[PDB]
Amino acid sequence: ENDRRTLWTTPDPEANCKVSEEKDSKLTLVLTKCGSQILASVSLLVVKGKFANINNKTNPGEDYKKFSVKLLFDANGKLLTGSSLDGNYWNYKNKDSVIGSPYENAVPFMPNSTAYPKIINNGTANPEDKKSAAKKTIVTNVYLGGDAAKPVATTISFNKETESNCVYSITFDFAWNKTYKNVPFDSSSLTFSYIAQDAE
Amino acid sequence: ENDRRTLWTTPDPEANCKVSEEKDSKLTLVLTKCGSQILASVSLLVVKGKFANINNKTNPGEDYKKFSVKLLFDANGKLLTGSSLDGNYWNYKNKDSVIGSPYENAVPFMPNSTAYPKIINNGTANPEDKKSAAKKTIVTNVYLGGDAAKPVATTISFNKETESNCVYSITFDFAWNKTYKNVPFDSSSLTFSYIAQDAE
Amino acid sequence: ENDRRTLWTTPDPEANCKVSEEKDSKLTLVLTKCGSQILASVSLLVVKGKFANINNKTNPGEDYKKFSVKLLFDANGKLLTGSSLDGNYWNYKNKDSVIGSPYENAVPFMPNSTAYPKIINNGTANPEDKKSAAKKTIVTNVYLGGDAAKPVATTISFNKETESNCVYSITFDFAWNKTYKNVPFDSSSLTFSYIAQDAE
């Protein structure tokens, strides 16, 4: 009904995500359709590993101050193995859980091919043929422990990845310059939208 | 018709809200059902009292430099007395207005208990199933006068309040570090979403 | 069916917008009806002229550091002549393309008159007598190249313009202080919502 309009991890998932090692994080992502767009809410709590309690005082160095989460999808919109997120509880909504069986098609939840092409190349491109790099991209912040003093630079990129010969993709890139001393990666929630691929 | 999907005060309200004194502010809040999520828009013009002409030069203190707006719901999603907003014109959409008679049940507009649960704040071990307080929070900025130079740090908290045996809450926290000389607290409009509760 | 819910510039549009010269930019604007709000997504690529390759080091004046795009509408919600945007492939969705006929009436997709009204005389007397300019405004940054290091102050504004006896107006205002050196104007995507005009 309204539930085929939503695809999510669950509102309160079990560990379902690899940031650093297997199942070290809980990603709550809900994708909903309002017509031609997807309306999305995301959140990330990391419960163990390299980012469960950041200390950039005792661990400075690029690799302790950034990471990314990738949703990779095949032609029908099925999650592919190379993904950060586990498929077990990624499915269509049902009264606060997921449908019994794993889904066959979710093309209408995928970021548009046309608005978000895989590669743009404006080296030798005439101006009227030029495409937008930036357009595939939402740049905002989230906040550790929902504290304004603790921003984390968030980039959401559509159809950026090539991993696993995927045809669609949602990437969440996270980075910070503050040197956070003993702060869990526990994010505020973030609203975002993108243009949906057309079914059939 | 499609106004059953909207619960919204009014597009243009009479002073309907308490920041510092009774009916001292005009809160515009619309909540629309986009399936499993609520898409909200919010503005706050304070019309009289302590925040109606901010002067941190003359009043340098903490209590002049922040305030908070609490909406308190019961089990049926009806608005409780403790709330900053008054329920006279808080109701479903009829054309450009509300339905005459106050609503029985708005539970499906409330923030999801599962996504955003009650957390009794005690020293808690084992982060691998501690429920996240950050998740319940959207952190962003509104701009006073719609001017980029005049930011206000804005925290939107779901299911945070303990007051009046509320089951559900939506709390707007406005704070600013900058020292403003005669600026009316007059916010830019802010878009946000959250995961909705389900019903019968 | 559901396509009559989307008023859009194509997802992958031809040069369609005047920032500086006729047809110097590709504006992507998607409007979808979600109940009583419009859920919008907006992005701007400039391909020629004065902002096709910003260099505030060679061009340091204000006129090279800011520009605005005006959508102007009439009482049917159809585009007018003064509009930045060429109203020739600006139509209701049909599949991944656009409908045969030009779009007739689209009043349901306009910013709400009551919510965002035209400015008059303001006074401290409060029988009802306050107007918030800010309420009419969403203020945020977008990011050139989708780079965190390259913010641009963005203001969206509803029913503000007076040009060509317009009833309804959407205006995107861009402004930066940073001195960009050989940066195409190519904005990261922006999600936003506003209250719709009530259809009849």
From TrEMBL, chains A, B, C:
Ligase found in the keyword field: no
Domain (Adenoviral fibre protein knob): residue spans on this chain: 1-197
Alphabetically ordered keywords of this record: Capsid protein, Host nucleus, Host-virus interaction, Late protein, Viral attachment to host adhesion receptor, Viral attachment to host cell, Virion, Virus entry into host cell
Main location: host cell
One of the GO biological process terms: adhesion receptor-mediated virion attachment to host cell
Domain of life where this protein originates: Viruses
Coiled coil, from the record: none
Subcellular location: Host nucleus; Virion
Family: Belongs to the adenoviridae fiber family.
Name used for this protein in its record: Fiber
Taxonomic source organism: Human adenovirus 49
Full protein stretch here: 182 to 381 of 385
